[PDB]
Amino acid sequence: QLDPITQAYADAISSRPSLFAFPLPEIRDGYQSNVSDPSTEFTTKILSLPVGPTGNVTAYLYKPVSDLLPVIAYFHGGGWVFGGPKSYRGLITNLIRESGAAVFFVDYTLTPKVAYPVPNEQCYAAVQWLLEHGEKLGVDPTNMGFGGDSAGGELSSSVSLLSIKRKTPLPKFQVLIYPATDLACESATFKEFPNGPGLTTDEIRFAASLFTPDPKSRLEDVASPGRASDEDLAKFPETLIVVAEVDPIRQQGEDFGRRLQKLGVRAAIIRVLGTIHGFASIDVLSEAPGAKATIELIGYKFKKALH
Amino acid sequence: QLDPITQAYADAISSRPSLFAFPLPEIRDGYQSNVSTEFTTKILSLPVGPTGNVTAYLYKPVDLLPVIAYFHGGGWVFGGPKSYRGLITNLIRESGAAVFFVDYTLTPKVAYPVPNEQCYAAVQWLLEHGEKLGVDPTNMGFGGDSAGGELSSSVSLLSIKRKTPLPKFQVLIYPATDLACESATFKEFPNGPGLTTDEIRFAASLFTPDPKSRLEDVASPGRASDEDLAKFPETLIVVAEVDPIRQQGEDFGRRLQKLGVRAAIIRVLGTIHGFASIDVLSEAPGAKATIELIGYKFKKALH
């Protein structure tokens, strides 16, 4: 059922207590290994953007070393509670290495210091900012990708939906990695994998309660882009969806994808067998065969779609 | 459930009669239409195998090239360099490797185990003579789709039984791994577009008329021993979702993982059997993405 590398990880993390319980650590971001090895190199610009509902969004612009670079706007996962530039260093260096693109990593504010729709709007505003200021930073905003995993997938598709509603430019290409696309309903696989390793169904309900304390929010399309209208969804950018087989959240990605296919959006949907939620960002899992191959595909696919 | 491009193709050939019926055409290979410049072509007559001859095509793209031994599909009844021109062009472009395309004899002109042994002997020849052809036999991949997947894993299994060099990397695309048993997806997609259970039975009766032949591990490497399978080279298995034989490639993958060989298994949703070589389908998003992945994975694995 699970590949060795993945099964070994799943064992050492039943040892673990749910990190998603009260109280929450003041620190929500950190290096997984601090290996501390490269050998893909990129420059970093730290950005304080005077935008978004809180007045400020922190972003990191990463550019690979050596006319305007393509740029991937990346929205990280971690249940809206955790994650950031440090814990996502592996995935970002992977994307950069394989895609040759710049990465615009939005370090949005974490729950519960804010709640829906503030992180969504922060992400959306960062992207607007990027559209306007990107060229003078050496990236080409007319050549943009969207990428996000889990919560970041929700944010990715949310930002896409908000762009459609506001008639601001969409990205050329979007990748959703086991996205949360419907916070309102429990799909078939919530049942199928109540504890099924790597992501518990109680860790899901909990993050939803911090992100969307008003359950009525979850029915809104900006919150749950899976519940968007046919008419809006039909305008989504070409989208690649990648899901883990053993994942409470698997059905959302697949449903969302089928929905796009039905509406005539170019949408590729790929399920990776023998792997668990988090395979794209957790360092250990990312070296398993299926994970490693699809991480490469994601990066390669940005490279081809973004020019 | 199927993406628009795939569904449109399915509607189109919904009327068209199955090729897997008598009379079989005299000509079993042909261009999907219509007529390289990205690679050279060398036709090889190999004085090997049970028939005395195995035809192979060495394709080289623009020090020693890596080389992919490719075993084409077509239910053992059809196929060759012409019908597979698209996939091969893709593989060469995406991978940067030479492709060593084994044009094994089709059925029922021959039958099991002759194609298997032809493919096996072709690889032994390549191992000996590759460097002289400008490729590196120590930097070798296997790929095959469907029947070609059966053939690929069969050559892998024979290499293990006979102690001859395995490849660095292997790609099986909706492979046939178990000719003896009917899987869950046989029932789930008995008629489902792209490949029917009727067609599977047809090809099986020509390739392996004796049911007992289907139980041999060389015919069905999915039934090999745990001891042998555990020595398989790192494998990537890609399957289509709506396909009677989907179940075979996944079961084979799980067994590889269970036995500790590096095995990646990927299911592509909304697409059918044949998406990797059928020119129309190749442009659908899922299909396009996985053909690229396959070519890319050969690039990464072969140096």
Residue numbers in the entry:
A (entry chain A): 34 to 99, 107 to 347
B (entry chain C): 34 to 68, 72 to 98, 107 to 347
Copied sentences from the primary study:
As expected for hydrolytic enzymes bearing a catalytic serine residue, TmelESTs were all irreversibly inhibited by phenylmethylsulfonyl fluoride (PMSF, 2 mM; data not shown). Additional details of the active site architecture were revealed by parallel analysis of a TmelEST2-PMSF structure, showing the sulfonyl fluoride group of the inhibitor covalently bound to the Oγ of Ser190 in all four monomers. In this structure, the Oα of the PMSF sulfonyl group is hydrogen-bonded to the NH groups of Gly119 and Ala191, while the benzyl group points toward Ala247 within the hydrophobic substrate tunnel. The structures of the catalytic domain, including the active site and the oxyanion hole, are, instead, essentially superimposable among the three enzymes and remain essentially unaltered upon PMSF incorporation, at least in the case of TmelEST2. The different kinetic properties of the Tuber carboxylesterases are thus likely to be ascribed to other regions of the protein and/or to subtle differences in active site flexibility or protein dynamics.
We present here the results of a detailed functional characterization and 3D structure analysis of these three T. melanosporum enzymes, designated as TmelEST 1, 2 and 3, which are shown to be non-lypolitic HSL carboxylesterases closely resembling archaeal and endosymbiotic soil bacteria esterases. The 3D structure of TmelEST2 shows an α/β-hydrolase-fold with well discernible cap and catalytic domains. The latter contains the core region with the catalytic Ser-His-Asp triad, while the less conserved and more dynamic cap domain controls access to the active site and thus likely determines substrate selectivity. The active site of TmelEST2 comprises the Ser190 nucleophile located within the conserved Gly-X-Ser-X-Gly motif, the proton carrier His317 (β7) and the other charge-relay network residue Asp287 (β8).
